[PDB]
From a paper:
The catalytic domain of the terminal oxygenase is the well described 2-His/carboxylate center composed of a mononuclear iron coordinated by two histidines and one aspartic acid inside a large hydrophobic active site. NDO has a relaxed substrate specificity and catalyzes the dioxygenation of many two-ring and three-ring aromatic compounds to their respective cis-dihydrodiols.
In order to study inhibition of the activity of NDO by inhibitory compounds, we also complexed NDO with the known inhibitors indole-3-acetate and benzamide and determined the structures of these complexes. The structure of NDO in complex with benzamide was determined to 1.65 Å resolution. Benzamide does bind in one orientation in the active site of NDO. It was hypothesized that this compound should bind tightly with the heteroatoms near the mononuclear iron because the aromatic ring could be positioned between Val209 and Leu307. In addition, the amide group would be able to interact with charged residues on the wall of the active site, while forming hydrogen bonds to the water/hydroxide bound to the mononuclear iron. The O atom of the inhibitor interacts with the side-chain N atom of Asn201, which is 3.6 Å away, and the side-chain N atom of Asn297, which is 4.0 Å away.
Residue numbers in the entry:
A (entry chain B), E (entry chain B), F (entry chain B): 2 to 193
B (entry chain A), C (entry chain A), D (entry chain A): 1 to 446
Write the structure that this text describes.
């Protein structure tokens, strides 16, 4: 993509396109689909320890940002463009997992209900790190609790996955640029 | 409801009618007597440092543009075109010499003046009095050590006086530390609570911490962690509470400089704050240098709250009686190493931001307490804030304000609601002053 | 609107202003004059049989905790903490000796008493009067053969008297059958209708069945199925209608024991009910034993409805003028074989539950009729309930109440709305009684 | 608010209080004084041409059934059953001899009469007075060259007189062209704006076109395209503006027959309109034949708007103060070739329909201007409509009405709001007339 | 999964994980995806008779439950935990199908519009019944009617499918534990 | 499908079923999935020129209709049944693309955020035009802008795709019958 012609396209987005439009490996797309479906299943049943053990690499960065709304024509104002809703290493994910599992987490009684819908899976091996897999996917996440609270989240995820212990593919980076600037879901206390 | 007569807050601030968290007519009345009258947080110098820099902010339910002028001052204006009332600015921050309306193209300067009108000569001739068509300007804009507040009411006390006795406690961190920066952009989330529920919680509620935040205390390993599940009551003299004439108040937890931050930041922070405290002993004295590195949970009346040391900075923007838009920034000390500032900012959002695990513990408390204020059998019921009543003092030789010399109590609730009731029942600042001429006496009775 | 003077229901209950289904100010007035005054369904013994068992229930828009006491009695309390008003219980059912608030940890007993306050000695000393801080208790809780109702107004008639002439019709199934059980948990669905729309439909509307439920009658093969598409009018004396002083009423369809249940349950039910009827002839007489196995469509004023024999039990919980939360339980006879109870419960939900195909037929009727009450040209229009007027009797030698001796009519609408208007225009029970001293005479005019 | 006294629109229509776009109490008052009083667009002959054809339409917030009678007339009725108030018709268009209610099966004729009641003889006997139970009929239904309008108020002026001076401008296209057809079905979209925001925009706003629609003008290549980004002001005498006693008004852009249509339709349209104009010179004179092929942006007070030549036909159906349901039809000349009619209809929707790229340019303007009318600091602020004031004339020898002889101005805003204020402050048509006896003098002052 | 460690995980959910994490057959996942996509297509166009004929086995149990909200720490209260929104055999499904198709079903005029989104498909053969296929999938179901009524349903489905007449795979069990306790969709009169 | 028996099924819908139930080619379904996922990616990042260049054939008809609500039993009223929300040839799409990219499109500042979820993909070659591919898919489209505006669109898409320049498969027809009659999304200014 020429972003001087496609005026609305960011440099970052143009680079990610390039990654998937080149080599297509059908088998890899299917592996990626399995990986993400299994990850979503573990999260939906709130098997957060199992998720850490089976899906998340020790070197992970798990990041969800919220970008400040700026003018399309803005060129001068150069202060922090985004804040981190999540920017977690493995130990920080573990803290959040223990917080979910703590028997004095009053907000988890009665038990929450999660349903995740993963679509638009794309996968490509890294050019330089032949052991690094880039996976892109979109998620709809439905969280229901306490009779009549329903929150639905929508996001695109840019992931890197790598074989770790036992040859199991694990998440080493997730990046989400959350599309809604003001959350209307009470909080973003869900793992996208 | 007759707001001149209706007792919404009982004498000494001991109780409040539960309807105050749910009544939409009262919410509308607050827009006039609370939000159009008092000082509201806008931004920080660090977010609009250069000429032309601007942000948008809420003041009550109104939106304003807050702009750095060429002369270094800051002016704020309603984000509403003077022609047919379209919203002028659709972004949150930027840099510009002015703002052009996307409806008919009227151009306003960063100083609010109507500077250009398309085809003015051919259309209006010389008949348009642009001089009287500047954007509607916020009457008062003042700074507290870089923190910029606005007030629609020209008659308000200066911001320093409005802070009253609370200013003394804020100064060690806001002034003597060398100054703070606000790290943007803020997280923004809507909660289904009245703005007063988080405001009251931050102003004076330490009682809830051990129980509400049991899981976060146990899981995060912060220095306040002994409290998890009410396993341990803080030692004697672990802190105090204070409140002030115009409603602002705070709790002080002695020495708690690492605040809510998880163990990964504790040693570095405790080293940094202790080192600066050592330097400050010589300049501001031991008590105030200690206050600098003590955790303050504060509300600046009506709807701006903070946890110093933790570095959490909140605006509870009102939407309706059971809807509030929460803005969350991080505050950091300017002379901290940049990498520490970055990690501190991330940790503020980790604990109290949109996916803040601590902040999530409070959700159901705030939301259900607020929504219950709409329920028929609860409207006329009494919310209690009597903990510590009869033990507060005023005019202490060391700690100013109405002060409860205990870490946990409801002193600051009482001062917050005393000021609230005085405003709701008053038509202007003069009437508030008349209604407040014995403010500390009322709070220290018995 | 002046509720003392405004004629919302015409003389003899012949018509009602359409605004009653849409007006939010009237809804708010109903919270006071209908829901805070009258008996409301809470639960059944079968759902809280053991000491410590509790459920949550709505009473109007308020939520209550309903708890089995150690002595075997039942008490109910507002589900609201006495401290800062947080919702105490977040689940629908359970077993506990008390309830601890997740905000500051106050602990209330199953008897509503404030039993523990964290660090009470260190914080409040001896100053907290826990004796006066028990949960706000529902003044009146009474049972009709296991069915538990509550009333916020201490001045209400006892529940038995409040049922008036309707009790006679309910007793064969509720008492003489050996007793009923409520099978939980209920289905729960929100519909965009006023609570009065399904209430009026269940109290007295047989006219709609053939047309509204044409598809369900044709498809399900139940015993009322000849009615599909208005293909056949029920034979003479196929049933009757009744109403009572305090608003409760019902239709009786003779012998219809299998009710709405599809052909897969018809022979078994008709055998079971007929066998019990045979035994009941000797004890309560032929007429009442027949009533036992006759289908009753009933509303217990204001918002609890049922179809006996079909086994449908409904609560129309009000949310606002055009929103109602529908709770659906199954009722079964205790001495039925367990496998039949299970299949009957499933069939109740199949027909009238959240995916109830019969209940779905009614959706558009209830919702549009309610929403049309907000429309400008319809607010002051008259909803008609005159079918059968001038043919009702009172004081009959066999069937008590105001009675229409015909299967299809609007007798029960008239009694429901007569009681409604008397309450809306009255400030207390004494005034309702004064407004009702000629209740049956008004209903039987002409 | 006292609508007799409150100045919502200043003298000469020069300004309006911003609250008029946001105040819900005023919205409710408009249902009475605007929508229940004035003429509202229903349908066109072309959509219900044959006996039995019907459509549903909104009149304010009410829904009506509009039916072609056997005698060729059109009658309209509230879409509400006379029994228990259910919505009678659930579709948008069809053909039928009557309408049967899905609740209890009452059958009404296409003439509104209650014609059948299920089992009437057995149930009601001879007691039901069906003669008095016909559907509630819209008092007045009249046609302007095939365009059918309704009015709930029997006292309204005839539709021709209500159009006042605007009718003269509409006639060349609506009458002398041989007649128009409305192409259905309409697009339907909800916008979060007050109905007055698009109404005022269509009645008299040419000023916004170059700036608001810059991208659509640049991208689509239509004949008004020189205006993109305010690059060029229209030549002198490029058009005019007019307004009338009862509020209707329009802008005229000379010769702009291809309107907003992209270059793909320009040559064909400019040929077609020019050819018909040539024939019309002889019959209606050069000025009026020119008006035929000139672009009119018109609002027929209160909430029906159009762009002739572009062929856009709009109804701004009110829902609440900040919600409007937009209906978009295409208008075409009956004698156009069918393939051109098809392409013109598609182009109307392409530009101004649900995915209309022009219409999308207006979204934020309408929505934010409306929503800002709820904001505390803006409620009492003044929306300006003074452009061109002091240069309007009345009684011109060539162009009737209050006329601004310039292409761009706010003449039509002033007339629209003068009529609006006169209605809001009046209890009936006689009072409006009294309040309007010097209407043109007020508009042409200075 | 060890549910003594992963405290939030139910015994039922842990067993269903185990089913899919073992043998992975890519071809089976693709067959399952086809089966469900075709089923959803038939339902979306309201071909309810065709759905019964082609997709539903004679021995079917079609079950959707609503579970009462109970304390996470609850151990004593042991009354009925759930009610059945649906618990249908083939004849009961047929009744519901005839109810939909009846020309006096007034609620079906004007015609409803359905759009189904099926995601997260997993498939595994039964260990003991080599002819029984377990399929898990998530559904978003959009129902629109009468101008401005829109209801969106979200659920996870646990299915068993088996070859019947003509070797055609048909549904023999569907189980859904509906995630929202109080429905905000007017009713649940849709086939999930 | 017999539409005389399956009373709720339209003749058009019955014909489209027939297309996919016959020949199943698994490889074709996977190609179709890739094609649509890549198209959605380009649209989500607002690469509208790239979308035209890479995804849209010169002979395209891009059509979204809104059907008037009529009685299920209606047989006499025979006026225009639907209007065209979109009915675009390539040049008309280009106009809309230029409108999006114009720097004076004020509504595009701050930049919009799009997330598309494509599911239920089916593909079949045409019987007569062996170079014409029929693809059916469903889309959920999430559009977020200006802090708190969120609009979610739901639709089924009937596509024809054909190899054009360079052998690249491109869209030659898209047809959507939009399921909601009254839009509650402010507008339908999105490419479904
Ligand atoms: N109110 C609070 O959030 C708080 C947090 C930490 C310490 C004291 C108070
Ligand atoms: N009103 C009712 O639902 C009813 C049902 C069945 C029989 C009689 C009445
Ligand atoms: N107000 C309008 O939409 C307009 C459009 C085109 C030309 C003039 C006015
Ligand atoms: S509304 Fe801003 S220029 Fe007209
Ligand atoms: S609100 Fe319940 S203990 Fe404080
Ligand atoms: S409501 Fe229409 S027939 Fe009863
Ligand atoms: Fe807290
Ligand atoms: Fe019914
Ligand atoms: Fe415009």
């Amino acid at each position: 993509i020429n972003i001087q012609e496609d005026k609305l396209v960011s440099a970052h987005d143009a680079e990610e396109i390039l990654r998937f439009f080149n080599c297509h490996d059908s088998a890899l797309q299917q592996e990626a689909t399995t990986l993400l479906t299994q990850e979503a299943h573990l999260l939906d049943i709130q098997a957060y320890r199992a998720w850490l053990e089976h899906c998340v690499g020790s070197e992970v960065q798990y990041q969800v940002i919220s970008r400040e709304l700026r003018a399309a024509s803005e060129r001068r104002y150069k202060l922090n463009e985004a804040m981190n809703v999540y920017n977690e290493n493995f130990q920080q994910l573990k803290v959040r997992v223990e917080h979910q599992l703590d028997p004095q987490n009053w907000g988890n009684s009665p038990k929450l209900r999660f349903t995740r819908f993963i679509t638009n899976v794309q996968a490509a091996m890294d050019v330089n790190d032949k052991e690094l897999l880039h996976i892109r996917s979109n998620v709809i996440l439905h969280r229901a609790r306490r009779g009549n609270q329903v929150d639905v989240f929508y996001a695109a995820r840019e992931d890197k996955w790598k074989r770790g212990e036992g040859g199991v593919r694990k998440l080493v980076q997730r990046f989400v640029d959350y599309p809604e600037r003001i959350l209307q879901t009470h909080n973003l206390m869900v793992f996208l | 409801m007759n707001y001149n007569n209706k007792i919404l807050v009982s004498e000494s601030g001991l109780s409040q009618k539960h309807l105050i968290h749910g009544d939409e007519e009262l919410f509308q009345h607050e827009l006039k007597t609370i939000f159009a009258r008092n000082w509201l947080f806008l931004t920080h110098d660090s977010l609009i440092p250069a000429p032309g820099d601007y942000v948008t902010a809420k003041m009550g339910i109104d939106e304003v543009i807050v702009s750095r002028q060429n002369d270094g001052s800051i002016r704020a204006f309603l984000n509403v075109c003077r022609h047919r009332g379209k919203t002028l600015v659709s972004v949150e921050a930027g840099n510009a010499k002015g703002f052009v309306c996307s409806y008919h193209g009227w151009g306003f300067g960063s100083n609010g003046e109507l500077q250009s009108v398309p085809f003015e000569k051919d259309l209006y001739g010389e008949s348009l009095n642009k001089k009287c068509l500047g954007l509607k300007e916020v009457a008062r804009v003042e700074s507290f050590h870089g923190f910029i507040y606005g007030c629609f009411d020209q008659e308000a006390p200066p911001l320093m006086d409005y802070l009253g006795d609370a200013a003394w406690y804020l100064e060690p961190m806001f002034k003597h530390s060398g100054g703070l920066e606000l790290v943007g952009p803020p997280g923004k989330v809507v909660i289904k609570a009245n703005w007063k529920a988080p405001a009251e919680n931050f102003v004076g509620d330490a009682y809830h911490v051990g129980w509400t935040h049991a899981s976060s205390l146990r899981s995060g390993e912060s220095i306040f962690s002994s409290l998890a599940g009410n396993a341990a009551l803080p030692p004697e003299g672990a802190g105090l509470q204070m409140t002030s004439k115009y409603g602002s108040g705070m709790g002080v937890l002695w020495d708690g400089y690492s605040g809510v931050h998880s163990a990964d930041l504790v040693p570095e922070l405790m080293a940094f704050g202790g080192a600066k405290q050592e330097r400050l002993n010589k300049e501001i004295g031991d008590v105030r240098a200690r206050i600098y590195r003590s955790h303050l949970n504060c509300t600046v009346f009506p709807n701006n709250s903070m946890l110093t040391c933790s570095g959490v900075f909140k605006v509870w923007n009102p939407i309706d009686a059971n809807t509030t838009e929460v803005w969350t920034y991080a505050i950091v000390e300017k002379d901290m190493p940049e990498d520490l500032k970055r990690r501190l900012a991330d940790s503020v959002q980790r604990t109290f931001g949109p996916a803040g695990f601590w902040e999530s513990d409070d959700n159901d408390n705030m939301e259900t307490a607020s929504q219950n204020g709409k329920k028929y059998q609860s409207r006329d019921s009494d919310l209690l804030s009597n903990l510590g009543f009869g033990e507060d003092v005023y005019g202490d030789a060391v700690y100013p304000g109405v002060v409860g010399k205990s870490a946990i109590g409801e002193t600051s609730y009482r001062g917050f609601y005393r000021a609230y009731q005085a405003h709701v029942s008053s038509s202007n600042w003069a009437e508030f002053e008349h209604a407040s001429s014995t403010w500390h006496t009322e709070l220290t009775k018995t």
